[PDB]
Design a protein around this ligand. Structure first.
Ligand SMILES: O=C(Cc1ccc(CC(=O)NO)cc1)NO
Ligand SMILES: [Zn+2]
Ligand SMILES: [Zn+2]
Ligand SMILES: [Zn+2]
Ligand SMILES: [Zn+2]
Ligand SMILES: [Zn+2]
Ligand SMILES: [Zn+2]
Ligand SMILES: [Zn+2]
Ligand SMILES: [Zn+2]
Ligand SMILES: [Zn+2]
Ligand SMILES: [Zn+2]
Ligand SMILES: [Zn+2]
Ligand SMILES: [Zn+2]
Lengths: 173, 174, 173, 172
């Protein structure tokens, strides 16, 4: 048993390992989307930059969880990072919708992890989730929601003009 | 007891000033409501939101200046309930702009009646207070709302969501 | 219909947030009233006025932040009439401070009931929103009001007008 | 008749000359008060500075009225500046009260002058009074009101401590 481990339940440790894998998976999804919009027959550079930045973000979430694992004396156990469900993301609207869905899966997972910390009386872990992840998930979900709303309002995915202008005026600054 | 500073300040003027204070606070409430209507995830027009929030704080300033005037002339401030806006859902940017134009025309008419009253009561300080701090600000606000409505309509709003998106970007994104 | 971002956001929490929005606006109105009470020519405590006006703007910020949260979690804002304060004449600086302490303790109790609600409904994001943005701010405001009341009393308020003048100069100035 | 005069009624011209005299009188009052609080047996340096500043301000009001008179083609006619009603102003509270009273007299005169401009259809003169005098009078009257209120609550004029601390923390 680790010399630092204190009040860190094995269930919390396993849940943290699974959450690490999930964050890495999300990072992979965003990488895929970004270079999908980098394609010469899609050519939405701001969608590309947006989803690449999100990918690096997920990388940071994962690495922070691995840091937490070491801090509490748990042991990191990595699993295969599954490839995303799609190779072709269709359009900017569809990519935003898949990102909203993914983000709500990740959020649900973090809510279950926080409930686990609460039931196991792990206030440090619950506060870690609260402080570093819960509000970031809420903000990401709201932002994706606004993007979906505006793209649909503009006429996506039917309007390539719509996705072009959204790429320029919304994701371009 | 009569205020030590009170001079040429008619009781009708004092009551009209309290009513105008409440009207300004009401306008502020309206603008707050509109702003956070455009803050919704299923509306998502951040520049409409920022615009109407700025208008809301402005109305706040209008009220506070009216209360300061009230104290300056020796009147007594009496606050009333601030009524909630007529709408919870503002439909679209075009409709919010039209409701705002209408509201501003109500506030302007109220201020014009206040200036008529001050003039009839031979209150040049109050008439000049209204003139200098409110009348032209109302004319400018009404002209600006009018231009916004005109452009949103020419662009194809509210049927065209592209119209309100682009208007939010290129006109209110400032 | 259900918001596309709504996740783990209970209707009871949503209604409580609407009521809290109204309460924050009510407090803002109270503070406005007090401020311009001390702006009167027969009271003339400019630092009491500035203090309570600042408190009013602060309350406004509390409200707008609650409305932002409402939209973030997918709830729907429903505004109600803002009731006028209980007093038009606040008597003295001491009495205004005590009325403010009372108001702040009611607002704090409301927020504590909101946090209990978020906890029982397993809403860690809402519980952390309340915790981080409201609980300690209420505690600090209550402590400050308590110190002000204590000092005014010790100086001899409200019977001694010198007390409230000097307090306005050296404490609120 | 002046080459510039237009829509300037003789009544307005005479009223402007009287207002010039009134402003100068007020300046005199404030000068007297200032050097009263400069006395070695009063020694309220901030009351003194305050009332001296008021005196110079009144001078500015007068000179702006004389400038206006020349602008409209009227002719300035100066009269004796009457000495203040008092040589000894008693205390800071009493000086503030006399200043509030004086300022309400000057404000009343300015309001009569404005009503005169309205009845004579002189919008330029009415707006001159509105923009340059009315609100300044309201602010001065309110400020004197605040000062009187505070000096009284503090225990003036019976308490010399009250007027000392007021001189330090409010007018200082
Ligand atoms: O302007 C008017 C009409 C009016 C008022 C006063 C006069 C002057 C007068 O009556 N002199 O005997 C004229 C017109 N009312 O606001
Ligand atoms: Zn993540
Ligand atoms: Zn994410
Ligand atoms: Zn207004
Ligand atoms: Zn307005
Ligand atoms: Zn608050
Ligand atoms: Zn508060
Ligand atoms: Zn619990
Ligand atoms: Zn916490
Ligand atoms: Zn003067
Ligand atoms: Zn003067
Ligand atoms: Zn008229
Ligand atoms: Zn001191």
């Amino acid at each position: 048993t680790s010399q630092v481990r204190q009040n860190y339940h094995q269930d919390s440790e396993a849940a943290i390992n699974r959450q690490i894998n999930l964050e890495l998976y999300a990072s992979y999804v965003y990488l895929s989307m970004s270079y999908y919009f980098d394609r010469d027959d899609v050519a939405l550079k701001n969608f590309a930059k947006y989803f690449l930045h999100q990918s690096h973000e997920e990388r940071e979430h994962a690495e922070k969880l691995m840091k937490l694992q070491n801090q509490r004396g748990g042991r990191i156990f990595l699993q295969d990072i599954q490839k995303p469900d799609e190779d072709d993301w269709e359009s900017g609207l569809n990519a935003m919708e898949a990102a909203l869905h993914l983000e709500k899966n990740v959020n649900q997972s973090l809510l279950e992890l926080h409930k686990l910390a609460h039931d196991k009386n792990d206030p440090h872990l619950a506060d870690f989730i609260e402080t570093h992840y819960l509000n970031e998930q809420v903000k990401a979900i709201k932002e994706l929601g606004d993007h979906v709303t505006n793209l649909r309002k503009m006429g996506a995915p039917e309007s390539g003009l719509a996705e072009y202008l959204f790429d320029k005026h919304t994701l371009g600054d």
